């Protein structure tokens, strides 16, 4: 089915405790294949997948060179946003950036994402046309003019429609065993309250419903082994829709 | 791969 290559970056300002805590995480669908913790001793783009290890030097040296560029960009962006909102220097704030590209069954470009946040609130985002910007507040209008002078959208569109798609296809081929896998959830029920357990499914996109309805369902959660799990309960038929089951499953 | 070309806020 469709695939995406998201890149999540988080920088948290530490007041008086040194440089900001930057954590860069790369995702292909719901599988994390790279990571970068600035507090780690490695100071390299640590691989988080077995298939990404098949790529040797002159790739990790390039990923590392670009992820310290994200770290340096995010560390400075923390001070830019603190001055935009006129905040104190003794507080801990966060900048979150997510960019990625979606594809389809033909693995051709489908959609592009590039969003920023400050303290959990939307700051700026790339519109679906990938030419215009949706600035949230008046502080993000200053970013909009600077990013429209630099044609950042065109460069981002070049990445999102170009490099991102070609690299996702390479990732989808390097890690076809894991990235392209699909596991049907192991649905089972427990016993009043009736609860159905969707276990060990990938990707995380699942749907659980109850029909004979004020259900009690939790978020899907990582099992830790590359899979996910979920459950829903109703006080007193559990229907599950996942890519691993072409036909609906009723419990 | 990561986005090669970045820009500050």
């Amino acid at each position, epitope marked *: 089915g469709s695939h995406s290559m998201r890149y999540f970056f988080t920088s948290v300002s530490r007041p008086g405790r040194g440089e900001p805590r930057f954590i860069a995480v790369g995702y292909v669908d719901d599988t994390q294949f790279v990571r970068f913790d600035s507090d780690a001793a490695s100071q390299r783009m640590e691989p988080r997948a077995p298939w990404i290890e098949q790529e040797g030097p002159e790739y990790w040296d390039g990923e590392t060179r670009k992820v310290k560029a994200h770290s340096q960009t995010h560390r*400075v962006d923390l001070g830019t946003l603190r001055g935009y909102y006129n905040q104190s220097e003794a507080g801990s704030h966060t900048v979150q950036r997510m960019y990625g590209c979606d594809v389809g069954s033909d693995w051709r470009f489908l959609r592009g994402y590039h969003q920023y946040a400050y303290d959990g609130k939307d700051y700026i985002a790339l519109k679906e046309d990938l030419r215009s910007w949706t600035a949230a507040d008046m502080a993000a209008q200053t970013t909009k003019h600077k990013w429209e*002078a630099a044609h950042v959208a065109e*460069q981002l569109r070049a990445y999102l429609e170009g490099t991102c798609v070609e690299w996702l296809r390479r990732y989808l081929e390097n890690g076809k065993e894991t990235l392209q896998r699909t596991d049907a959830p192991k649905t089972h029920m427990t016993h009043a309250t009736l609860r159905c357990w969707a276990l060990s499914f990938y990707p995380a996109e699942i749907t659980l419903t109850w029909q004979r309805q004020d259900t009690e369902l939790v978020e899907t959660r990582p099992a830790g082994d590359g899979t996910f799990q979920k459950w829903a309960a109703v006080v007193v038929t559990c229907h599950v829709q996942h890519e691993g089951l072409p036909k609906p499953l009723t419990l | 791969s990561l986005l090669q*070309h*970045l820009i500050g806020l």
Partner: antibody, heavy 117, light 108 residues
């Protein structure tokens, strides 16, 4: 990479200043290729950069006079100043912008353009 | 544009000296400050970007710091190849703006 300017060093006043900067050791690619002039004795001034698609960000001080072009087929981007006066006499460096759009990493050797009739 | 200032204009120093060069900005430029080294007759060489990060290949004796509305370039244990002109460049808002430049001489 290696950047080399290939423009005439003598441009008549009130005439078009054409400079070409060849890129060796690589390609134009997705980098931003800037024109920076350092007049003899003074600091550096940034003219503007060109993207491979032709989208360029000019310096507003000379936006109406500067035309910057890219010839990615020949891996060279050009600068075409117009109505050039004596104030345009400078060492024109062609540079590559740093991957976070904040500095100029790779520089050309520079070319001294003299404006005199 | 954001006019850029440097302090001092010249730094007469000797080999083994510790050299400090200061830069300022008319408006807030965040930490988007780069440091360049330029020998006469040659193109500028980038040393420090984002006011703290060292460029690859630059000797570790070059250091940068930022306290607030102020930026500092430090050369601990100055060497004979470090005598040049140094520029601070802002990149918070377009256009890119450079500093006036600070020259480091061989003191005698």
């Amino acid at each position: 990479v290696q950047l080399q300017e290939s423009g005439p060093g003598l441009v008549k006043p009130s005439e078009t200043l054409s400079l070409t900067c060849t890129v060796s050791g690589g390609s134009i690619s997705t980098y931003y290729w800037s024109w920076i002039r350092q007049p003899p004795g003074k600091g550096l001034e940034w003219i503007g950069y060109i993207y491979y698609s032709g989208s360029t960000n000019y310096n507003p001080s000379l936006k109406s006079r500067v035309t910057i072009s890219v010839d990615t087929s020949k891996n060279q981007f050009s600068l075409k100043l117009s109505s050039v006066t004596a104030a345009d006499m400078a060492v024109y460096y062609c540079a590559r912008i740093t991957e976070i759009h904040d500095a100029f990493e790779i520089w050309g050797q520079g070319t001294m353009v003299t404006v005199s009739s | 544009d954001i006019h850029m200032t440097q302090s001092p204009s010249s730094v007469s120093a000797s080999v083994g000296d510790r050299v400090t060069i200061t830069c300022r900005a008319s408006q807030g430029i965040s930490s988007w400050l780069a440091w360049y080294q330029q020998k006469p007759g040659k193109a500028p060489k980038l040393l420090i970007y984002a006011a703290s990060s060292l460029q690859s290949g630059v000797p570790s004796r070059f250091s940068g710091s930022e306290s607030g509305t102020d930026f500092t370039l430090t050369i601990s244990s100055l060497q004979p190849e470090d005598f040049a002109t140094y520029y601070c460049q802002q990149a918070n808002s377009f256009p890119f703006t450079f500093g006036p430049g600070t020259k480091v001489d061989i003191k005698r």
